[PDB]
Design an enzyme around this catalytic site. Structure first.
Site, PDB file in Angstrom:
ATOM      1  N   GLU A  45      -2.096  49.024 -87.972  1.00  0.00           N
ATOM      2  CA  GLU A  45      -1.908  50.134 -88.913  1.00  0.00           C
ATOM      3  C   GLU A  45      -1.808  49.670 -90.359  1.00  0.00           C
ATOM      4  O   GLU A  45      -0.986  50.174 -91.122  1.00  0.00           O
ATOM      5  CB  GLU A  45      -0.697  50.996 -88.494  1.00  0.00           C
ATOM      6  CG  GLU A  45      -0.740  51.429 -87.016  1.00  0.00           C
ATOM      7  CD  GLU A  45       0.358  52.418 -86.580  1.00  0.00           C
ATOM      8  OE1 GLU A  45       1.413  52.559 -87.285  1.00  0.00           O
ATOM      9  OE2 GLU A  45       0.172  53.048 -85.502  1.00  0.00           O
ATOM     10  N   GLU A  49      -4.352  53.139 -77.103  1.00  0.00           N
ATOM     11  CA  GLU A  49      -3.173  54.010 -76.926  1.00  0.00           C
ATOM     12  C   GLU A  49      -3.641  55.462 -76.697  1.00  0.00           C
ATOM     13  O   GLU A  49      -3.195  56.403 -77.356  1.00  0.00           O
ATOM     14  CB  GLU A  49      -2.247  53.945 -78.161  1.00  0.00           C
ATOM     15  CG  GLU A  49      -2.077  52.549 -78.686  1.00  0.00           C
ATOM     16  CD  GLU A  49      -1.096  52.403 -79.854  1.00  0.00           C
ATOM     17  OE1 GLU A  49      -0.411  53.386 -80.279  1.00  0.00           O
ATOM     18  OE2 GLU A  49      -1.029  51.243 -80.353  1.00  0.00           O
TER      19      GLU A  49
END
Length: 314
Positions: A128, A239
């Site tokens: 991220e 995910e």
């Protein structure tokens, strides 16, 4: 005979787990039946493993590795560097020096990678790091975390180098969400291109795939996979889940077609996609709560109509 067996000639199917998923018989029966890859939902993150400088906690992660060692499953290592679930001490009231930071990061990566290099087949090395969208051209592409504030983009390079030293056989990924968004997926590509050209040791790109019913079209997702395909030979959906919002028959139908559309797209890209990992085992343990009906297993650890559609394809 489950999901893994159905997608054997396409790619692995995985699941993030918590302590209880690998300790409760009823849940263990499911996990072994359906999956051939495992990610620690929390136990390998930086604060869970090093809550103070040099004071490692392996309890939770060891249980999960234990479970994998025993069942002949390999793990994904989730994550070595991230602006969340991280001990403030690594990067600081005041920020530390590039050098004092790189050491805290090197010490951490190298420990953990060495500890689990026998079960982990790949590592989400940095998480991220690319900035959220709206980035007005010329403005900084990367998220302005403390680590960036100190190192700039350089700390990502070091993290991939440090992990490569500790295990040259592991595939090392960059991992991010909104992976199919045009602007951001372009920024992600840019980052990874830079690394490839510098000869930094990156192998793959991690597509979180926190999708939803209205969020990305299958065009957008198929696009980003093509784009990513031209810079790396390894792609994981990392995910995966599809939240219904942002309990009706209609919503259930909507979520079913997306999952069916999504797996049509990924099957076409079998050769670059090595893994598709769902973020939790079932709605019961979804980080989005069960209100969001997000996985192919319902709150009782039982399959939904959607489970059979995704699985019985062709």
């Amino acid at each position: 005979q489950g999901l893994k067996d159905a997608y054997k000639d396409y790619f692995k199917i995985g699941v993030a787990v918590n302590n209880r998923n690998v300790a409760d018989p009823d849940q263990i029966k499911v996990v072994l039946r359906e999956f051939n890859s495992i990610t620690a939902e929390n136990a390998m993150k930086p604060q869970p493993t090093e809550p103070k400088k040099g004071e490692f906690n392996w309890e939770d992660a060891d249980k999960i590795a234990d479970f994998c060692r025993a069942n002949g499953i390999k793990m994904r290592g989730h994550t070595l560097m991230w602006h969340s679930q991280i001990g403030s001490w690594m990067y600081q009231g005041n920020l530390l020096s590039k050098e004092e930071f790189y050491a805290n990061m090197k010490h951490h990566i190298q420990a953990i990678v060495n500890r689990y290099k026998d079960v982990v087949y790949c590592w989400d090395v940095v998480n991220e790091a690319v900035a959220d969208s709206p980035v007005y051209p010329g403005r900084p592409e990367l998220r302005n975390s403390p680590m960036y504030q100190i190192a700039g983009e350089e700390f990502i390079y070091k993290a991939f180098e440090y992990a490569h030293e500790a295990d040259p056989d592991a595939l090392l990924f960059y991992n991010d969400y909104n992976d199919a968004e045009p602007a951001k997926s372009q920024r992600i590509y840019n980052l990874v291109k830079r690394m490839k050209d510098a000869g930094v040791p990156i192998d793959g790109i991690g597509m979180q795939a926190h999708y939803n019913v209205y969020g990305p079209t299958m065009k957008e997702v198929d696009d980003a996979i093509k784009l990513y395909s031209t810079v790396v030979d390894h792609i994981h959906l990392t995910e995966l889940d599809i939240r219904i919002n942002e309990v009706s028959d209609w919503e259930r139908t909507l979520q079913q077609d997306q999952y069916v559309q999504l797996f049509k797209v990924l099957r076409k890209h079998k050769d670059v996609i090595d893994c598709v990992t769902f973020w939790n085992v079932s709605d019961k343990d979804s980080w989005l709560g069960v209100r969001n009906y997000p996985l192919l297993f319902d709150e009782n650890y039982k399959p939904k109509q959607a489970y059979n559609a995704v699985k019985n394809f062709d």
